[PDB]
């Protein structure tokens, strides 16, 4: 009954699903109790043949039956689900709903400014889909091609996906928070034959230029052979490169509403996102089309308990997996609207999200932790002027989320009448790993509770590298046994995703991630045991940011670490030596815009410290540990003596 | 009994279909009476699912199941048939046929002389369609490209299109009487990898200029890359140039007999074929796979009454809709011969097409009015010459029939023993969607009587745009949903297809005509609304002659009109206003033949000083039609012309220069 | 009982199958006695699409199904099987049985130095073909296109071939024996985009200069796009052309071990295997996928008697059709192991092979009898120094087998305990024509006994042309309709391959060879009637060293005829005749030849003479010199001869120059 090493378990009740949420549940429950979960669970694991078989026929359409439901093993990087199938993700996505109701809504597009909302029904998806998918096939975009996606999150990111996917090719979607650098490195790793952008974007009711870093980064991206340009804002004084640059309305004015979909293998890659892990540069992940498909489908389904009534409003980005799976493919495989929000939470008023929830009765919220700190800081009082009843499930992503928060949030917005889910996941598991399904699992406020289907969830002593037996233990989290959603190679460098993922601990999947397993089986997250900092939900490398700041010829070397923060939950602190050859307080924000223009303005460090040299081993590589509690003011060996430095230069510039 | 409005109808008796049809039918009808076919028709348009999934599992071989029997919307242009099935043209056309009886006749080549004339089997075309596409294969021609064909009514127009569409490309057949500018025009809008082409053509005993045309056309045409030319005449001074042009004969030699067909989407582009409407440009219509198939199937099945036992001999041209979907696709989907005549129904008598039909005993026989006034004017004496007993099925394409033809074309031709069939139908239409059936349908002399399955037709009052309801009626026809082998788009222009034919009347079809209905029912063709004058069966916009007369930099403005002509059915009369008197005319009439074709040539052109113009600024045509129609005297209104002199210059000219 | 005409027949005692090769099977044989071979033959030649459609279905996994059994005639050259269906070799031969048994042994690679060999199951197979695959897709290489390889025999060699099929693309294996003037033809036929090979090889403990002779054709190949490059040797000194080569570890590593495979029709092209015949250029023989997958099936199955317990060792290489069908397609399709030996019978001692089949347990052994005949000469004592009673089926291929040797073999090898399969067949036919079953046709030392299943086999009297009726008669080796495995064409040449096959004789396939049928319907092999030589079982063209001789133009005119010779069956003598040109210049011809053929096929002799017999019309009389050649320079049969007195030039200088 006492924990002797998951400490964050002991006294902590089991909070029950509400009773309201059943009230508010439109049908029967998929899973009846945890009883039903574990047997179909045990089932997932100890029968992956008799059990994702009969779900992937009922989940997706096929084009193509398959064979063989699971191949490959993961110590050999040869993993394989539903070989032989074929099937197209735009049509399981949009043309399958669309032929049953295709006035059913689809995209609710919440524009950063509500006079620009609007919704696309099934059927105006469909035509929108096929039209640029029309566009990309009349410019030689076949089969086997990727094509680079650099938009904000509104229905024309969505559209562009999908009708990159319709052609059997490849969408590497850029993230609009990056720079010409970013979108340069991923261009150009993928070969894109075309980008898909917009002329201006509009977030927070701020313009973002957006057409001219693409311009900034094409300039060494010599794959792209065209670019489909949307006006978002339509402002005349936009350059348009003659030959190459062509209009979204303009080019899709000139085809049809109705393209046929090319059917793809199930292990056909879907598409690229790159994820920056302990790496430096940025590397491509890659998903299968049916695995990932179903993955999505399934724990969209049960996880969050999504019915064919339902609404999600997953406050992300498809910039990030977070988009991906659970903005675009999870709701619209299950036919449901999903709700596509372009702006923050804070423009006009901390009511957005809530005002969004009321007006379409979303009956789905997915969010991260940061912007639950952020509203509570300042938005409590607004939650309370609108209408929250119409939700039943809360989702949290990205991030821990504190007991704190996880109380403030089943309160505030939930009412103590909503079911909470902290998912756990990657992007290269491409859904969820370990979340409370709704309506099924109790919570623990903190805690993401049991492995998902499929997922064989397991720690290792980190020293040993030998699976723990037993609960009340911690060690580095890792899965036994690849699954239907799991990555399938990092783009053309499938040798750095074996050391990443399979060969640091063989025969296991290595998540980067710590975790602990208390006597009642629930998994709490511990975070990241590489040089990964998690800023604002936005997964960043420490490698990345240290490289950023190298760029500028006057840095002899970099340091970068994490620390806590009260608001984006980590932050990063940038330690620079310089090189001989004035005005430190400028010198500071130099290296803050080089990093802002290199990587992007959100990965840009928090505070920059110059100090004369940094706390260098005997052998000579930095050690971060001195850096990081000194940062944290926990100041309490080749240079011993700039260790004093360090704390003089922190408590100065900081 | 009497009619208010549609005066045809009035005092028009039921004309019953010959007994003689029936017992020259090979076996038992495909419907008996009105009765089943009024229902059949019911559920194709209150339960398309329920009516034509069936029929294209039948008539069709799939390669893949379809999922989806209809889908979209006429008024948001995303029309769509069988979603999800894979097939292929050529598959349905001849492999099929070629494995159950590899020796029964195909195509039937009745070439320009006798002399050359052969017969190719069902076998023999798979190996020759095998070749050419082994060729067009070998040259990178891959699913998704075009390929242009520009050859004569011969066996290896058919071939090429079937060829092109065995590789999953898009053929786009250029009428063999079009210009060099013509041709230039097609292939760079449709950016064609690749051009069919022969040395030269045989018609009419002449020699045409095929290669040479090409050549011309191909100078401004960067993205053909190979050309394949047949040797029609084997003149060895026709030139092709090195590394680009290459003989049918020599590259076929080195390819198998047997080629895999390439599965394409129902949906899938099966052909492009430019036509002319009231735009200036012609455009290109686009047809999809599946659906046009089926069309063609369905309606020369059931129309046409074909059975396995016939011979279908359509008099018409692969450069046009008429021969695509029933010289080509319609007969050979059934598996029946089709008989393909290069020459003209004068070489070397009028007796040319009876000669035909009785040397291979064709039982059905579709030719457009305009053959049969010429043939009535010069030709009626050899009819009788022939036996002519095999046909049953007589049909008339292309332009209104009037009640003499068709009298004409029921005594002279059918003996009042067969059945006539007036199809009205579209190049967008893909198939027919007027007609009397075969054995089925009672005639009114000079109507098309019901639409057929899939074809909600109605009838819109132009000036407030609503649907007529209730018979003896007129006005613009109009398609209430859309049907398989509608056409889909315009290629890589679909604002002017959606601009063209569902814009106009949102939620309809607009095919461009007006008609009337008469208290039973039947439909009678009106003609055109818009610019578009029917030139001896061929489809022409008053805009492109237009356009043409006025590339002459002697000519200032240019008005053309349609007016009715007893021998062509309908005439264009060019009016020319020059910038500052018979050889001027021959340059204007030379300029139409050499910016579209010799086809084209206006009949006469009227040189006048200043044009009829309106107080908005557009020119009034209809005084114009008025005027060279001999009507000059009962205007209805010159009230509405900024320059009201102008008319008194426009009868003096032309009642001068017609006759010159 | 007595033969008047196949004199090979008299006295020749009918050799039963030994009882230790049925107790030595796993299972109940497939085909119990000749009785029931005799009406399952019945049936594949009466009834193909009852016989072959289920077998198809049996033995071969389909991505679709497919309509049609059989297609196409022999006179016609458009012969097609299984048409509609779809599948892939390497899904056939490695995915589908990994999925089963991924541990189960695939290759079983015997390398030169034993200390090399190692073990793929079919799981690692699967992952290696994925990896060069991915490479290969990352290339830009696609369906409908070919890639060459140069390898020598061992797992890479397998790997490359399964690679490209995986793709949709045809795999072009040139034999590593050939020099770059070879390797250029072959390359610049089929336009090759890309060239798989390795740095080096190791064969008898030499190391062969593999890339090197890739460098040297690649100058003149301006298709191949990049070479993937496997370092055998590791050897630093081996250079690579950056932009163009790259090395397989390095590429490989990048890419998982799973590809999707790319569904190809039954009548794709699964590879190109260019083989020589009287014409002097080597022709592009190309083979469909699932016609050419079931035959080596069905044959392996059926006539080596080879079921799922079972290891082949195929003694041969992949640069010839007996390495692609029995040692690559045949073994793996019946998801058996496969015994990959790089080496020869030689190295280290004559004892290799035996070796390898005691090591490994192999229950099938397939060879050629040129190793035979070796291993008689120089390692008849080694034999019995290992355990060979795990082999049951012993197999004779490429060569007439004498019964000497037959005896030899069935004895020393066999303990008079196996069944002996004299297999019969050409890279042309892609499986065994004629072949004794084992464990159901008794053999005749010498004889290939009956058709295999699907063949008809015929003679014709080469004068008349006229199949010839009844036993005890000898001819022209023709087979009366096409069979699934036969090859479909040659590569954009299928004009020679009409001449070559299916011209010859109307209605027949022409083996080239001669062939007698006994009373009991046993067929005895004569030999090429053309001018082809069987060097070591290596298909060699008599046109093609001559070709290779001219080129050195110290060379007026040349003569290359076949010899017997006691190890190697047949060798090559060339005649030389010189302009203005001894010892030095003999081997600098001989040189010539290993530069633009390859060592193997270099002559045995060059014998130099003043001028050679030439016709009237100025034809080199060959037979005059084979005679010469063998000693029998009096029984010349010479009517053609302008030069009478050349003759006697030629038999002392052959009996000079033929020892020094
Ligand atoms: C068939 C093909 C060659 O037509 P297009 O060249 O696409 O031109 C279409 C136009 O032709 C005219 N029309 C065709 N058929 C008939 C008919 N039976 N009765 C009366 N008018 C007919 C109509 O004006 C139609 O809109
Ligand atoms: C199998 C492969 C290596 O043959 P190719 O290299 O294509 O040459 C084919 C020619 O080889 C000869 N032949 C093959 N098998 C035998 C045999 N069993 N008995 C006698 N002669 C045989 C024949 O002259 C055949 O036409
Ligand atoms: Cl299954
Ligand atoms: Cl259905
Ligand atoms: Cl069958």
Redesign the interface.
Known sequence: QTHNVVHEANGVKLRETPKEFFERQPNKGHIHDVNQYKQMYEQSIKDPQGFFGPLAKELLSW??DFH?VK??TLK?????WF??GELNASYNCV?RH??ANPDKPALICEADDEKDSHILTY?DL??EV?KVAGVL??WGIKK?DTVAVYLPMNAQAIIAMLAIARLGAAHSVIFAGFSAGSIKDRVNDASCKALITCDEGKRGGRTTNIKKLCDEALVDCPTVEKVLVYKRTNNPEIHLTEGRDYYWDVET????????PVSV????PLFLLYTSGSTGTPKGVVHSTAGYLLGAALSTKYIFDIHPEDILFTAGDVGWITGHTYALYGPLLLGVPTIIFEGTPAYPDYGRFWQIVEKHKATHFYVAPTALRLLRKAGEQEIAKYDLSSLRTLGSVGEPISPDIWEWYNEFVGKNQCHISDTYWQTESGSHLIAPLAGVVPNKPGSASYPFFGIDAALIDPVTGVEIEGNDAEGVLAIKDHWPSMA??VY????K?MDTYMNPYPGYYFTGDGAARDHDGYYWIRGRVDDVVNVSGHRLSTAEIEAALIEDKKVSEAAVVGIHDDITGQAVIAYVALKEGEDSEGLRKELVLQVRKTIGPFAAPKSVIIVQDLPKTRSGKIMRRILRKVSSNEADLSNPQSVEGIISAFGAQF
């Open positions: 084009d193509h063989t191949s490959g050999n990087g040869d993993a394989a070989l032989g043309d669309a032929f059927g469909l035509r096929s096939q009349s086997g004015a000139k085809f049809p509403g109705y393209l046929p293998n199930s292990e056909d399938r190679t053309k460098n499938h040798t995703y």
